[PDB]
Design a protein around this ligand. Structure first.
Ligand SMILES: [Mg+2]
Ligand SMILES: [Mg+2]
Ligand SMILES: [Mg+2]
Ligand SMILES: [Mg+2]
Ligand SMILES: [Mg+2]
Ligand SMILES: [Mg+2]
Ligand SMILES: [Mg+2]
Ligand SMILES: [Mg+2]
Ligand SMILES: [Mg+2]
Ligand SMILES: [Mg+2]
Ligand SMILES: [Mg+2]
Ligand SMILES: [Mg+2]
Ligand SMILES: [Mg+2]
Ligand SMILES: [Mg+2]
Ligand SMILES: [Mg+2]
Ligand SMILES: [Mg+2]
Ligand SMILES: [Mg+2]
Ligand SMILES: [Zn+2]
Lengths: 66, 174, 66, 37, 141, 186, 130
RNA sequence: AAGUCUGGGCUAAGUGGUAAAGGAUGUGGCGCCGCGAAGACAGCCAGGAGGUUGGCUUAGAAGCAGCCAUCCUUUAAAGAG
């Protein structure tokens, strides 16, 4: 989740995430972070390493388009 | 969920003899007599001793578990025997036998001399380890307890008499 | 330093050792000289220099006004 | 020992025993030791 | 705290605490209630003490219903005077409460949060109480 | 959604006596009949805690009959908060006036803000046919903020069921919560 | 009663989909060992065919209700059912015996195995890949 | 003066034989549920995991200063604790 910092718009998330969104991404930019950090996880899919980005999509608050 | 109905495995060759209110456990290391409620019935099978409740109310369920373990501790008593170890920690502190007696040096101006009652024997391997040994589980338990009380573990330092396995818990001292 | 209403600022290793920086009210410093030495088995020290002025919380300042 | 009219479990390692006619609360943390009275 | 904005009469006779509640016996607002098991004059300070206790337990959350009101004036003679020379002065207000009355109700908070808050509030009250949960029997009234 | 409950006949048996025997005194009636009855307290309670005055109850009587009823009113023991008497309304082909449950579907925007949805009406009175008796009456409350409100006029109502109270009546609302920040002045 | 009824579901199914399912003792294994026998037995066993890891009582009721040989290996002790026939193996049990007979003490184990449709014996199913 | 009267039950405090809020594995009788040979409860033997030092903070807050957020994944199982 280092890579979802330079593909959102912020360097520091969104203060109080979940209610205010200050940057976002599509259903395929979720996959290019999946493309790099792939041996980084315990999975070997693409829509499994995208659900582990669409699940880190609310730590900083950078939501997803879908 | 029940200590009393559990069967008491009697090793060969120790002999459990039954009587009104008592059972006699004779073995390789000695003999011990166990007081037993007349309400409880001790009964002797083959290589196994059992205990039965005349009823299912409190007083009897309570006496039940107790009685079987009382006998079982005597059984184990005369066969394998019982022992506790005491771990002396602390700089100045060290121990030794003086005859059958035990001499404790534990920071008092005077050294302390404990003398073993009948059936209890003291061993001092290392001068920081002491082994209280006997066939009566409760008497071994007591003597151990008495000795340790002479200088209970400090609450601020690893200093004093310790049970083997006793964890060393300490608070800061300012 | 917390029990002196002091607000922390930093930790770094110097002579190693380990150096700290902090914001602390002049008031809660008297004989900190001697407290530190107890808190650190006499193995610690400090330097201390003036910074600024700021608000005293409401429930202390008024006692002075008699 | 705390001695009081309302003895209570204070933490989850506290234990209510009852010895010799009195309600005690014993615990690994000494501060939690209670007698009722 | 609580007291009538204005009264038709300033002091009133004492009366008696005979019998169960006239009404106020079922839950009619919240999810849980606190109900009196004994008769008493509940003082305004006792109510507000109970109230404040519950809000403080909720801290930002829940809703508190108060179903009794201290409309009864409490009189007490000036300290250390002898008997006579009229009825005393009004010194506070109380709510008359008989067994079965629902004094407080909470709503829109967890079961646990309601239970502890009602339990706590009950300790501020000079009588025994039981906590209740709104059931079908209540709604049918 | 339809419940059955055993129910016996009584004449001059003291309600006190019956109440002791674990039985609940009661009566059944409509336009046409009136009978002094009694049911087992414990069984009735198990039934009533889901039926209420909403869902139907049929009384299997000691003669064979099985009349479908609604609970009209239940008398409580004020001191002990326990039931001491039931009125069972024997239903017929006629339309009937009754209380229909409200489901409050949705999570109010007012709630999301620390607010609290006060369900001012948990059921609603209604003219309906014993055959056309619903179960739910759903109400969207999600669009409500602090402090907004709904008024039974805002109810939908399935075909065959008529709002039996004044539409000016308030059903549910969202108010501010208890806050310790308020205690500052309290 | 309970989700143990929804446990006879997946176990019957995934088993009645085989005939050569082995049984291992997926015990001791640490954190790395918890992804070792797991992902590597998908490097010689298709689908999620390493272990199913199920109640020994439940697998006993399966191989008994689905009549599949009634695998009377010794289903006592920690067991987890090495799926060789949800896979593509038989001598790719070499992949399991490998890291097993290497990593830590006793690593992964064996004690029973259905043989194609029959009964693979003791060290039999533990040498029918060595 | 007249029963150490009969039958059923409870109480182990000398309660009976001087008191309240409140506290309690005291004892006994009820009751309604929950888990349980598809193996529950107790103890005990494994594991109890990765994306992730979860956003940013403090110089460190890395599951538990601490706020908001709080998913999925390899799973028998494992809460962004
Ligand atoms: Mg000396
Ligand atoms: Mg010991
Ligand atoms: Mg207290
Ligand atoms: Mg607790
Ligand atoms: Mg303990
Ligand atoms: Mg008067
Ligand atoms: Mg008063
Ligand atoms: Mg009270
Ligand atoms: Mg009315
Ligand atoms: Mg009730
Ligand atoms: Mg009832
Ligand atoms: Mg007699
Ligand atoms: Mg006494
Ligand atoms: Mg007495
Ligand atoms: Mg007395
Ligand atoms: Mg009781
Ligand atoms: Mg167990
Ligand atoms: Zn404790």
């Amino acid at each position: 989740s280092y890579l979802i910092r330079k593909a959102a718009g912020l360097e520091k998330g969104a203060h109080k995430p979940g209610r205010e969104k200050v940057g976002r991404i599509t259903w395929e930019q979720v996959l290019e972070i999946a493309k790099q950090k792939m041996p980084d996880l315990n999975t070997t899919d693409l829509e499994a390493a995208a659900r582990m980005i669409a699940g880190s999509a609310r730590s900083m608050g950078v939501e997803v388009v879908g | 969920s029940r200590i009393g109905r559990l069967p008491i495995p009697v090793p060969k060759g120790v002999s459990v003899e039954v009587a009104p209110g008592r059972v006699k456990v004779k073995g390789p290391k000695g003999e011990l007599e166990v007081p037993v409620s007349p309400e409880m019935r001790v009964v002797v099978e083959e290589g196994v001793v059992r205990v039965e409740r005349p009823s299912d109310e409190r007083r009897h369920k309570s006496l039940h578990g107790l009685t079987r373990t009382l006998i079982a501790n005597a059984v184990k008593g005369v066969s394998e025997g019982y022992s506790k170890e005491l771990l002396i920690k602390g700089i100045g502190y060290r121990a030794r036998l003086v005859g059958r007696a035990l001499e404790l040096t534990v920071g008092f101006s005077h050294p302390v001399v404990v003398e073993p009652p009948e059936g209890i024997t003291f061993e001092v391997p290392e001068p920081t380890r002491v082994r209280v040994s006997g066939i009566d589980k409760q008497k071994v338990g007591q003597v151990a307890a008495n000795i340790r009380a002479i200088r209970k573990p400090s609450a601020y330092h690893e200093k004093g008499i310790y049970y083997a396995g006793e964890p060393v818990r300490l608070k800061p001292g300012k | 330093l917390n029990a002196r209403r002091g607000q922390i600022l930093g930790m770094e290793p110097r002579g190693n050792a380990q150096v700290i920086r902090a914001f602390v009210p002049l008031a809660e410093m008297f004989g900190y000289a001697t407290d530190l030495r107890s808190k650190t088995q006499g193995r610690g020290s400090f330097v201390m220099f003036f910074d600024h002025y700021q608000e005293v919380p409401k429930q202390v300042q008024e006692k002075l006004i008699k | 020992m705390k001695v009081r009219a309302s003895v209570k479990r204070i933490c989850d390692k506290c234990k209510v025993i009852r010895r010799h006619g009195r309600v005690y609360v014993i615990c690994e943390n000494p501060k939690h030791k209670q007698r009722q009275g | 705290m609580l007291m009538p904005r204005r009264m038709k009469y300033r002091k009133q006779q004492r009366g008696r605490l005979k019998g169960a509640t006239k009404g106020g016996d079922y839950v009619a607002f919240g999810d849980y209630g606190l109900v009196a098991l004994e008769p008493a004059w509940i003082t305004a300070q006792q109510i507000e003490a109970a109230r404040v206790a519950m809000v403080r337990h909720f801290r930002r959350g829940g809703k508190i219903f108060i179903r009794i009101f201290p409309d009864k004036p409490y009189t007490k003679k000036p300290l250390e005077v002898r008997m006579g020379k009229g009825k005393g002065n009004v010194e506070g207000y109380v709510a008359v409460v008989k067994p079965g009355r629902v004094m407080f109700e909470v709503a829109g908070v967890t079961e646990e949060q309601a239970m502890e808050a009602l339990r706590i509030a009950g300790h501020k009250l000079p009588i025994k109480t039981k906590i209740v949960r709104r059931d079908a029997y209540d709604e049918a009234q | 959604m339809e419940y059955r409950l055993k129910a016996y006949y009584r004449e001059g048996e003291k309600p006190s006596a019956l109440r002791r025997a674990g039985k609940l005194p009661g009566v059944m009636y409509n336009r046409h009949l009136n009978r002094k009855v009694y049911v087992d307290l414990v069984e009735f309670d198990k039934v009533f805690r889901q039926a209420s005055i909403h869902h139907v109850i049929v009384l299997e009587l000691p003669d064979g009959q099985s009349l479908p009823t609604l609970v009209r009113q239940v008398n409580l023991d004020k001191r002990r908060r326990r039931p001491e008497h039931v009125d069972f309304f024997v239903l017929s082909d006629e339309p009937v006036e009754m209380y229909v449950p409200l489901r409050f579907v949705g999570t109010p925007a007012g709630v999301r803000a620390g607010g609290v949805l006060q369900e001012i009406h948990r059921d609603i009175l209604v003219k309906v046919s014993p055959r056309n008796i619903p179960e739910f009456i759903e109400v969207d409350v999600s669009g409500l903020e602090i402090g907004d409100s709904l008024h039974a006029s805002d109810l939908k109502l399935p075909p065959g069921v008529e709002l039996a109270v004044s539409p000016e009546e308030t059903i549910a609302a969202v108010v501010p919560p208890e806050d310790v920040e308020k205690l500052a002045e309290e | 009663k309970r989700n143990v009824e929804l446990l006879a579901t997946l176990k019957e199914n995934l088993e009645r989909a085989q005939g050569s399912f082995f049984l291992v003792n997926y015990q001791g294994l640490p954190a790395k060992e918890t992804h070792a026998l797991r992902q590597a037995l998908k490097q010689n066993g298709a689908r999620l065919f390493v272990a199913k890891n199920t109640l020994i009582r439940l697998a006993l009721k399966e191989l008994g209700l689905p009549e599949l040989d009634g695998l009377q290996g010794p289903s006592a002790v920690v067991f987890y059912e090495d799926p060789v026939a949800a896979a593509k193996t038989l001598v790719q049990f070499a992949k399991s015996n490998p890291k097993g007979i290497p990593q830590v003490k006793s690593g992964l184990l064996q004690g029973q195995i259905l043989t194609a449709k029959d009964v693979e014996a003791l060290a039999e199913l533990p040498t029918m890949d060595e």
